[PDB]
């Protein structure tokens, strides 16, 4: 049932920019998201003090996927436990408590990839969060699909556009509602040559070239959010990447880097059918 949106696919209605994604299968400078556009978008919220930590995604009624550096990053003494965070699902507005719409859940357990490399390049920047109690789906809460080998192979290609969402800063200042932007996947060589950082296979970068004219990128607060694509084969939405890092935001000649979800699917399935 994953990847089919109650207010769109289920009703055969399409959001205003999805066609841009399909046409390519041959947040800074983003736009406001329509209601129910990303029912899997999750907000990582800090209790004391109350603030937006990062983005995240719902992949089942009990699991949330996000970037590991959102929880653990020694360079900034960042190390959160289950009791320090809250998960807000079904939101649209960044600051308002959407009564009768959003759902807030406590965490039962956090799982960070054992080989997450915070010391150097944030390799394997991924983590799973098990909710204490299952959340009920609705028109605004619905899981995204995780890719299978075949979907990843045919969609994760240079020039193919994906979509990123989040309540992060609008510039390297904050949005009132969920922002959205469609970005093209960039060739590995171009990614490697734009930074001094050692890029691994567990990553991919996306963004427009400085001469493409179009702008767009993730930014602070957006980390841990989903990079999703719509399969033109079964019309479902699949999460291909996780907003991981970047040097600044929407800076020319630079690109956002994402955790390669499929490459780490083995670890994901292993944790799920072993701890819950």
């Amino acid at each position: 049932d994953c990847g089919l949106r109650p207010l769109f696919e289920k009703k055969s209605l399409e959001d205003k920019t999805e066609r841009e994604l399909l046409e390519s299968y041959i947040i800074v400078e983003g736009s406001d998201a329509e209601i129910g556009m990303s029912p899997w978008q999750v907000m990582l919220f800090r209790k004391s003090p109350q603030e937006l930590l990062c983005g995240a995604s719902l992949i089942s009624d009990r699991w949330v996927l996000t970037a590991a550096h959102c929880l653990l990053y020694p360079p900034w003494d960042k190390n959160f436990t289950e009791n320090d965070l809250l998960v807000r699902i079904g939101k649209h507005s960044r600051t308002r408590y959407e009564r009768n719409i959003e759902k807030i859940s406590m965490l039962e357990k956090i799982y960070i990839h054992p080989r997450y490399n915070w010391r150097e390049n944030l390799d394997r920047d991924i983590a799973l969060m098990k909710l204490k109690k299952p959340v009920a789906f609705s028109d605004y809460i619905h899981p995204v699909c995780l890719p299978d080998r075949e979907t990843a192979a045919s969609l994760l290609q240079a020039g193919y556009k994906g979509r990123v969402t989040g309540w992060g800063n609008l510039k390297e200042g904050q949005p009132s509602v969920l922002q959205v932007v469609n970005l093209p996947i960039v060739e590995r060589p171009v990614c490697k040559d734009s930074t001094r950082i050692r890029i691994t296979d567990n990553m991919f970068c996306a963004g427009y070239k400085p001469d493409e004219g179009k702008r767009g990128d993730a930014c602070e607060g957006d980390s841990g959010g989903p990079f999703v694509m719509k399969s033109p084969f079964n019309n479902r939405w699949y999460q291909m990447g996780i907003v991981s890092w970047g040097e600044g935001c929407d800076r020319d000649g630079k690109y956002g880097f994402y955790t390669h979800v499929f490459r780490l699917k083995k670890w994901i399935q292993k944790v799920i059918d072993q701890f819950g």
Partner: peptide, 10 residues
């Protein structure tokens, strides 16, 4: 600037 959420969750 975040609106207070129910105490039940906190």
């Amino acid at each position: 600037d975040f609106e207070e959420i129910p105490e039940e969750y906190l």
